[PDB]
């Protein structure tokens, strides 16, 4: 109970909404959480990717090519898709597995992958970001 999102993880989600605004999308999907993850580009999630050979601007144009752009930009709140909601919930499940009592960008990466159906997961696994592999780069990196 009471697991807190890190201030870095919170930014990823705030960023997720704006990525979708820039693209004129009227939703926040898993892809925009991955763009947010990329946009803050600083956490354990970003280093776990780069440390596996994955270029975060490669990821960004890969995702941007798949989802395109919207006609016009919407206002106020843009709703999170259910599967984007399920990423954040799988982040907590991935943090707990490791025995962590917080949710940071590392766990958001794992939940994006574990979600296993969205644009973000499809892009990630095409680039070796396999779950158990990313789990291990997360653990060795976190050791300290």
């Amino acid at each position: 109970m009471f697991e807190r999102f890190t201030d870095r993880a919170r930014r990823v989600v705030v960023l997720a909404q704006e990525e979708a605004r820039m693209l004129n999308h009227n939703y926040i999907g898993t892809e925009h959480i991955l763009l947010g993850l990329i946009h803050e580009g600083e956490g354990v999630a970003a280093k776990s990717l780069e440390s596996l050979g994955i270029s975060l601007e490669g990821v960004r144009s890969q995702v941007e090519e798949i989802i395109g752009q919207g006609q016009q930009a919407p206002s106020g709140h843009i709703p999170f898709t259910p599967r984007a909601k399920k990423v954040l919930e799988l982040s907590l499940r991935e943090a707990l597995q490791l025995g962590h009592n917080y949710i940071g960008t590392e766990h958001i990466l794992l939940g994006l992958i574990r979600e296993g159906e969205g644009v973000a997961a499809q892009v990630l696994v095409k680039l070796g970001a396999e779950l158990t592999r990313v789990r291990q780069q997360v653990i060795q990196l976190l050791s300290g």
């Binding site: 697991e3 807190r4 954040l88």
Partner: peptide, 13 residues
């Protein structure tokens, strides 16, 4: 250990 999935201001209860 006890898991709650309400998202409430960035914390899961």
């Amino acid at each position: 250990v006890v898991x709650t999935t309400v998202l409430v201001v960035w914390v899961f209860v």
